[PDB]
Amino acid sequence: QNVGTQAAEEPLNLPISVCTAPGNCQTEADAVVLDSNWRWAHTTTGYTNCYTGNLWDTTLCPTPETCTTNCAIDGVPLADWSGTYGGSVTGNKFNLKFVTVSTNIGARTFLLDSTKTRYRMFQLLNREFTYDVDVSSLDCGLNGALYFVSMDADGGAAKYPTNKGGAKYGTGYCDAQCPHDVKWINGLANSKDWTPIPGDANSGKGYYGNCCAELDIWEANKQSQAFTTHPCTPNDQTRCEGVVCGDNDSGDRYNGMCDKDGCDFASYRMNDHTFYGPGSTFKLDSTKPFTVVSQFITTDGTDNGDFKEFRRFYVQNGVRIENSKVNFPGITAYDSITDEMCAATKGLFGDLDDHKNKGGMKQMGEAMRKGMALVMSIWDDHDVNMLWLDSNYPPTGNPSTPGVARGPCPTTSGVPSEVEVTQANAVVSFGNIKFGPIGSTV
């Protein structure tokens, strides 16, 4: 995309901590940038929309190349962050409102480095990543997500010279779902064969998808939470078409370059329904804030080893809370993501181990070694109504069959039109982000 001249781009300042030992950290003066999908797209030498509602203008965008020549994405000024997009920062806390009323629904954002010209790339192997979260106002059907993806640090600017904005304009998004709803891919409008998504007034799908590796630290609302590894072959940003995208709609979910299911550790799905929930007698009380700690263990305990284990623990009101465990007869009580856990649990659930097909923890680790961009988002799910996270999936499945039940939400929950009314004022908060060696962040 070209860059427009109507509004300066002003990312929100967000300090994080880089740590060397427990309680010995230094501030890193980073910032938050809005994903290019949420930006106004208009004519390069005017005010005329190139995209309105869920459609590209066919006169301006008869082809992707012409669209890209004629159109530009514009900046987010400071005033518009809260007023238009529902984003705000107080000290080291970042807040994202779900619906902001001209009416904005959801948000996806990235962490910029201290220069505000590149994404802050995190080399996560043999490191610990930690943050405080509040998901108390997110119920069934919503997801306040924090995760990493194998985006380029410059959003693709060096690879795709028609991308003028780079990381500064939140470009280059890709993930392990190979999404077609990304409006700008490889420096070009994804306007070919663009199709609105029914019941989604703001979104559509273009000819291409954009694939890359994804490490989900946090997919969650107050009812259920998960962390998940998604390797791809290769891991780096890859525009896809046809079978390579692994499109759900053509029966290709397991035929593409990315592991779409991922290998998940989701406490409720692993059959501990009392670990996490909205109340003081759950082990971890989702009505109150808490700290989420993630440790990425290698084979030799060094930065050069292969990724072998994703460990997790929590801190809430000064109380250390170890992760829940897998709880099925004849299955080891795993409390972390490893290749063995993935094989054993997917075996039990009858899920295809595409994680293993894509190179497993080792391949996931190669993405983490090269460095990944931090994503913070809030969203509802127009495909599957978040049932995969917090309900029975498939909805018609027996909840006593291992793998089906992922949370207590009813199978009628999560319809975007309903959650966008009922949960309009939901806000996820991510704060006090800390990064360092294992054992350094609490």
Q: Which of 9, 128, 219, 309 is catalytic?
A: 219
Give the integer Cα–Cα distance in Å for 132 and 277. Answer: 17
Q: Which of 374, 333, 431 shows the shortest CA–CA distance to 127?
A: 374
Q: Which of 9, 128, 214, 366 is catalytic?
A: 214
* Domains contained in the chain, number: 1
In angstroms, the Cα distances linking 174 to 29, 115, 423 are 25, 23, 27
Give the integer Cα–Cα distance in Å for 262 and 351. Answer: 10
**Residue 432 CB contacts under 8 Å (≥ 6 apart), including other chains:** 17, 92, 93, 131, 132, 291
**Residue 102 CB contacts under 8 Å (≥ 6 apart), including other chains:** none
Identify the H or E element spanning 387.
Answer: helix 387-390
For residue 214, indicate whether it is catalytic: yes
Residue 416 near residue 197 (C-beta atoms within 8 A) = no
Residue 179 near residue 383 (C-beta atoms within 8 A) = no
**Left (φ > 0), alpha (ψ -120 to 50) or beta: where does 141 sit?**
left
Find residue 296's DSSP bridge partners: 310
**Residue 230 CB contacts under 8 Å (≥ 6 apart), including other chains:** 175, 176, 213, 214, 215, 216, 258, 259, 260, 262, 355, 364
Q: What is the residue range of 248's domain?
A: 2-442
For residue 418, indicate whether it is catalytic: no
Show the tokens assigned to 222.
Answer: 């107050």
Resolution in A: 2.0
**Residue 412 CB contacts under 8 Å (≥ 6 apart), including other chains:** none
How many CA atoms lie within 13 Å of 69's alpha carbon, on the beta-carbon side?
8
- Indicate the pairing of strand 225-230 with strand 51-52: unpaired
Radius of gyration of the chain (CA): 21
Q: Which CATH number covers residue 352?
A: 2.70.100.10
Q: Report the residue count for the chain.
A: 442
Amino acid found at 27:
T
